[PDB]
Amino acid sequence: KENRQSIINPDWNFEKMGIGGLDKEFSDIFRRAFASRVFPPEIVEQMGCKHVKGILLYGPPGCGKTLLARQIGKMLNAREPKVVNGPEILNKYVGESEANIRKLFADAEEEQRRLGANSGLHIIIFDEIDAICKQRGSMAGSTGVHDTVVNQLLSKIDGVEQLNNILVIGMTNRPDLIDEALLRPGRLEVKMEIGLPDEKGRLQILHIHTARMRGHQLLSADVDIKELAVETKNFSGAELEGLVRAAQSTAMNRHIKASTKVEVDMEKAESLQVTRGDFLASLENDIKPAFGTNQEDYASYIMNGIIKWGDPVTRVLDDGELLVQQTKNSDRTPLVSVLLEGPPHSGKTALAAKIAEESNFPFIKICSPDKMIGFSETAKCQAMKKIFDDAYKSQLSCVVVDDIERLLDYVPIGPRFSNLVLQALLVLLKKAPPQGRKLLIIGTTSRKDVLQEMEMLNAFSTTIHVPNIATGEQLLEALELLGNFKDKERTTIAQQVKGKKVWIGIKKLLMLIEMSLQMDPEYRVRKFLALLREEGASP
Amino acid sequence: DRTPLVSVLLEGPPHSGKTALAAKIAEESNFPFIKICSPDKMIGFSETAKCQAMKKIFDDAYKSQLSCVVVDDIERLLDYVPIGPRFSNLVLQALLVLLKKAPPQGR
Ligand SMILES: Nc1ncnc2c1ncn2[C@@H]1O[C@H](COP(=O)(O)OP(=O)(O)OP(=O)(O)O)[C@@H](O)[C@H]1O
Ligand SMILES: Nc1ncnc2c1ncn2[C@@H]1O[C@H](COP(=O)(O)OP(=O)(O)OP(=O)(O)O)[C@@H](O)[C@H]1O
Ligand SMILES: Nc1ncnc2c1ncn2[C@@H]1O[C@H](COP(=O)(O)OP(=O)(O)OP(=O)(O)O)[C@@H](O)[C@H]1O
Numbered sequence: 001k002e003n004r005q006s007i008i009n010p011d012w013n014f015e016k017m018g019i020g021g022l023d024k025e026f027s028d029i030f031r032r033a034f035a036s037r038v039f040p041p042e043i044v045e046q047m048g049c050k051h052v053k054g055i056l057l058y059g060p061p062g063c064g065k066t067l068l069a070r071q072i073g074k075m076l077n078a079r080e081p082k083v084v085n086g087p088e089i090l091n092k093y094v095g096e097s098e099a100n101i102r103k104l105f106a107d108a109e110e111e112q113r114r115l116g117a118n119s120g121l122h123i124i125i126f127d128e129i130d131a132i133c134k135q136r137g138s139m140a141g142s143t144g145v146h147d148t149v150v151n152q153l154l155s156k157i158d159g160v161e162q163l164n165n166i167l168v169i170g171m172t173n174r175p176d177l178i179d180e181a182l183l184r185p186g187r188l189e190v191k192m193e194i195g196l197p198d199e200k201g202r203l204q205i206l207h208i209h210t211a212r213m214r215g216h217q218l219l220s221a222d223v224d225i226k227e228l229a230v231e232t233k234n235f236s237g238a239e240l241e242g243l244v245r246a247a248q249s250t251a252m253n254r255h256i257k258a259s260t261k262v263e264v265d266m267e268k269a270e271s272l273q274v275t276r277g278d279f280l281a282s283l284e285n286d287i288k289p290a291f292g293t294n295q296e297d298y299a300s301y302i303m304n305g306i307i308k309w310g311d312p313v314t315r316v317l318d319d320g321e322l323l324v325q326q327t328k329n330s331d332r333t334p335l336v337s338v339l340l341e342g343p344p345h346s347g348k349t350a351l352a353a354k355i356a357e358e359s360n361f362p363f364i365k366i367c368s369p370d371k372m373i374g375f376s377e378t379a380k381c382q383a384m385k386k387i388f389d390d391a392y393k394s395q396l397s398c399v400v401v402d403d404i405e406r407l408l409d410y411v412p413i414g415p416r417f418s419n420l421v422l423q424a425l426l427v428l429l430k431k432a433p434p435q436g437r438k439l440l441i442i443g444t445t446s447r448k449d450v451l452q453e454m455e456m457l458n459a460f461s462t463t464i465h466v467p468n469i470a471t472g473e474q475l476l477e478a479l480e481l482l483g484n485f486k487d488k489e490r491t492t493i494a495q496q497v498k499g500k501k502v503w504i505g506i507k508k509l510l511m512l513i514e515m516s517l518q519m520d521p522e523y524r525v526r527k528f529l530a531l532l533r534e535e536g537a538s539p
Numbered sequence: 540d541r542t543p544l545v546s547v548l549l550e551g552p553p554h555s556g557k558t559a560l561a562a563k564i565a566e567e568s569n570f571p572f573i574k575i576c577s578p579d580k581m582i583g584f585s586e587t588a589k590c591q592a593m594k595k596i597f598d599d600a601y602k603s604q605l606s607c608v609v610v611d612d613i614e615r616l617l618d619y620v621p622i623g624p625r626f627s628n629l630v631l632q633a634l635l636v637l638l639k640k641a642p643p644q645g646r
Contacts, residue, residue, distance in 0.1 A: 373637065374591060406636060409632045
């Protein structure tokens with residue numbers, strides 16, 4: 001009796017493979033690939049369907065492709081897979097690459113010819129498949145060796161003769177360069193995408209990578225995984241594995257004295273522990289992601305924090321909260337916009353960054369003009385296009401565009417500016433993203449009239465005003481919050497300024513105070529007043 | 540500490556001897572890195588090159604704990620001529636953006 005030897009090893013447990021955050025992808029792969037080989041063969045023969053012989057995996061670096069491939073190779077009860085490490089098949093002579101490819105499908109052919117339908121399963125793994133296979137005719141100058149390899153591969157996977165007992169797996173990082181004729185159904189059907197995880201996936205990974213430590217009581221009692229899951233934002237699996245190793249190394253480093261002449265290991269290795277301080281240090285010093293925006297940017301954009309010197313500082317934030325709530329909840333207006341306005345030295349960028357921070361959205365990015373110094377027009381256009389494209393991929397996103405008047409080069413003489421960048425902005429502000437996704441755009445500028453004159457202010461849904469310090473009470477409140485002057489001096493300052501109206505931006509006040517402090521203690525207040533008197537006003 | 544970047548403009552009528560005073564101030568600062576970005580070394584350069592050379596001089600100054608950079612004849616740097624008027628816009632934008640870029644934290 002030709003017993004239907006299961007293609008699944010008897011001792012196989014999903015938890016054994018130790019993959020986290022990829023339940024749906026694995027479910028789909030298992031359904032569309034290995035479903036036909038597990039059910040009793042009589043029904044399948046009645047249906048008359050032939051099995052699938054292809055899988056393709058792609059995604060950004062460090063998401064877990066090779067792990068899936070290795071685990072799948074280990075799961076099946078079949079012969080050892082044949083693995084190709086990049087372009088191992090190219091050779092100098094003529095007609096040796098094609099032979100090297102043909103040598104891979106020998107056992108499959110012979111076994112199919114001998115045993116017919118009742119045959120084992122043969123697996124072949126391709127790694128970095130974009131090194132050998134490419135669009136036919138794109139390359140030129142290789143002497144014709146990168147144009148027959150693809151033809152041989154195509155003729156072999158599915159040709160006049162028919163095989164039914166192979167499974168080819170491919171991995172790549174640039175899915176757009178592979179040949180089109182190699183992706184049609186019947187050759188490489190199941191195309192999957194492996195992407196960054198969400199909070200639950202990160203928690204699963206962090207639980208998978210600490211089970212061994214937790215088992216042996218080497219992990220302290222104050223380590224809470226939820227906080228780490230929340231704090232590590234935009235991390236990909238590889239980074240989440242690296243952080244734990246960094247913490248472990250910093251924990252082990254406390255028992256080695258290497259400054260002395262000879263390395264010596266103390267015998268307090270017993271009672272070892274890993275404390276939360278190690279995790280915080282590892283987060284703050286060693287590992288840093290490579291996607292999205294991080295603390296290194298919000299540190300620079302908001303340099304001196306936010307202080308409540310009056311009423312407007314709350315009004316602006318409340319309006320931002322209302323706008324973000326509207327963006328998140330509603331469904332009939334996927335795209336929203338807003339404009340921030342005010343006189344120079346008012347603090348527009350800080351408020352925009354604060355609102356973006358408090359939005360709490362998954363994806364945040366900032367497009368400032370100081371990262372493209374010396375660029376021509378086309379470079380600016382392409383950079384903006386790339387940022388917005390990366391913004392489209394996610395579910396709901398927020399983007400900030402600061403200093404519009406210098407993103408397009410404006411100078412009153414003339415006037416002069418770039419038409420291309422203006423057209424790019426005017427077209428990008430009226431493009432809705434793919435269905436089921438939401439986008440918020442904030443913009444900052446210091447000259448409303450020019451924008452009105454160019455007919456760009458009609459593309460913004462609404463505008464928000466950013467006022468400026470106007471009364472002595474607000475100035476006294478600002479001074480008391482900053483607390484650089486003493487009460488005795490503050491009495492004279494109030495006695496003087498309160499009998500007048502002031503007009504001075506917040507950012508200018510810090511510079512004025514810093515300039516004032518340089519003088520001697522006895523002449524400070526006077527100097528400060530003088531500077532204020534020279535500032536003037538023009539409401 | 541609050542303000543890591545400060546700047547100042549020396550101005551006056553012609554033939555008054557102002558670049559010498561700026562050089563003296565820079566020399567008496569006693570800072571480690573002191574460099575003079577002058578148009579004497581940009582004869583025949585197009586706009587792209589002026590912009591890139593300015594950027595390099597301003598990048599070399601981000602790798603020292605203290606610095607002082609002198610710009611000379613802002614008028615000649617823009618190629619300004621009273622007729623028209625006519626000048627370069629890319630260089631002006633570079634300058635206007637390069638006077639507000641704070642250095643890496645701690646310098
Ligand atoms: N889902 C996951 N669960 C557990 N560990 C993971 C996971 N994803 C990644 N890792 C860790 O990170 C490594 C990811 O390396 P992998 O070979 O999968 O990367 P890759 O996507 O092929 O990268 P490359 O772009 O360099 O080709 C795994 O070996 C494991 O160390
Ligand atoms: N209430 C506040 N709102 C905004 N910024 C504040 C406030 N209090 C203090 N600041 C500080 O003021 C500075 C804000 O300067 P910012 O870069 O926003 O200026 P700006 O108005 O965009 O300038 P410019 O008009 O020159 O383009 C930051 O240091 C911020 O920390
Ligand atoms: N007290 C002083 N201040 C300035 N320059 C002085 C003084 N005493 C002597 N000099 C000399 O005067 C000359 C100053 O010329 P400088 O190069 O400063 O001209 P400038 O004002 O920059 O010229 P221009 O406006 O035509 O470009 C130098 O020789 C300097 O040595």
